[PDB]
From a paper:
The solved structure for Pcdh19 EC3-4 (2.51 Å) includes four molecules in the asymmetric unit, each starting from Pro 213 and continuing to Asp 422 (numbering corresponds to the processed Danio rerio protein). Root-mean-square-deviation (RMSD) among these four molecules is <2.4 Å. The EC3-4 repeats from both structures superpose well (RMSD 2.1 Å), and good quality electron density maps allowed us to unambiguously position side chains for most residues. The final model for Pcdh19 EC3-4 is missing residues 243–246 in chain A, and residues 244–248 in chain B (chains C and D are complete). Pcdh19 EC3-4 was refolded by overnight dialysis against 20 mM TrisHCl [pH 7.5], 150 mM NaCl, 400 mM arginine, 2 mM CaCl2, 2 mM DTT using MWCO 2000 membranes. Crystals were grown by vapor diffusion at 4°C by mixing equal volumes of protein (Pcdh19 EC3-4 = 14.4 mg/ml and Pcdh19 EC1-4 = 7.7 mg/ml) and reservoir solution (Pcdh19 EC3-4 contained 100 mM calcium acetate, 100 mM sodium cacodylate [pH 6.1], 25% MPD; Pcdh19 EC1-4 contained 200 mM sodium chloride, 100 mM TrisHCl [pH 8.1], 8% PEG 20,000). Although the Pcdh19 EC3-4 structure does not reveal any relevant interface, the Pcdh19 EC1-4 structure does. The Pcdh19 EC3-4 N317S fragment refolded well as assessed by size exclusion chromatography (SEC), but its melting temperature is considerably lower (40.7 ± 0.6°C vs. 52.4 ± 0.3°C), even in the presence of 2 mM CaCl2. Another PCDH19-FE mutation of a surface residue (E313K, equivalent to E290K) did not show a dramatic shift in melting temperature (50.4 ± 0.1°C). These SEC and thermal stability results indicate that the EC3-4 fragment carrying the N317S mutation is folded, and may bind calcium, yet it is not as stable as the wild-type fragment.
Protocadherin-19 (PCDH19) is a member of the non-clustered δ2-protocadherin subfamily that is located on the X-chromosome. Mutations in PCDH19 cause an X-linked, female-limited form of infant-onset epilepsy (PCDH19 female epilepsy, PCDH19-FE; OMIM 300088) that is associated with intellectual disability, as well as compulsive or aggressive behavior and autistic features. However, PCDH19 along with the rest of the non-classical cadherins lack these critical tryptophan residues and must mediate adhesion by an alternative mechanism. Here we present crystals structures of the highly homologous zebrafish Protocadherin-19 (Pcdh19) encompassing repeats EC1-4 and EC3-4.
Numbering used by the authors: 213 to 242, 248 to 423
Amino acid sequence: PVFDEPVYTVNVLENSPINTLVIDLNATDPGEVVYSFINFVSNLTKQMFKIDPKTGVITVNGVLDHEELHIHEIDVQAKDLGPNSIPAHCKVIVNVIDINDNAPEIKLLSENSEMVEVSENAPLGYVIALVRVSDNDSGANGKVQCRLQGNVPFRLNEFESFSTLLVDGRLDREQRDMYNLTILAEDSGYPPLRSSKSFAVKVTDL
Ligand SMILES: [Ca+2]
Ligand SMILES: [Ca+2]
Ligand SMILES: [Ca+2]
Ligand SMILES: [Ca+2]
């Protein structure tokens, strides 16, 4: 036998259903030849794909997760039931294509994820905390954007790779003691997924 091509590359959606076709291989024609995997660069690759020993059809066999692994290399052979008979080999590269299956995570940089205080004497601009928003997806699906909600005497400041929670108002512990702030976040995949974190700011005099 001889595979039509030496190397094949196929795209497959992440989260593809079990039994999704990946590729139908061919190393003969008009059969007694036996298609099999002989190697699996990652050992994870072994649960993700099955192949029909008779037709050489590879199908999805477990849950394909882009965030777990992007790209699979499989080595396939074809061998006739034969007393003496050499195998044909090919490589099958499976690109697992990322979809937006991950909402944005919103992280506060403080020593606690709500316990977060300030002094009313802090001026216009005092960075009280740092927020980091992440998304495990790639590309647009993973580009995130966020925004403080309600209106309140703070504001977020937009940097590449992080945001800073400032004061934007005269504070005094007497007029307003606690606050409840909400951060809303949205990624740029389709459909856009979105996430939000509500967290407390307690004010002090010192
Ligand atoms: Ca075939
Ligand atoms: Ca995933
Ligand atoms: Ca994804
Ligand atoms: Ca996402």
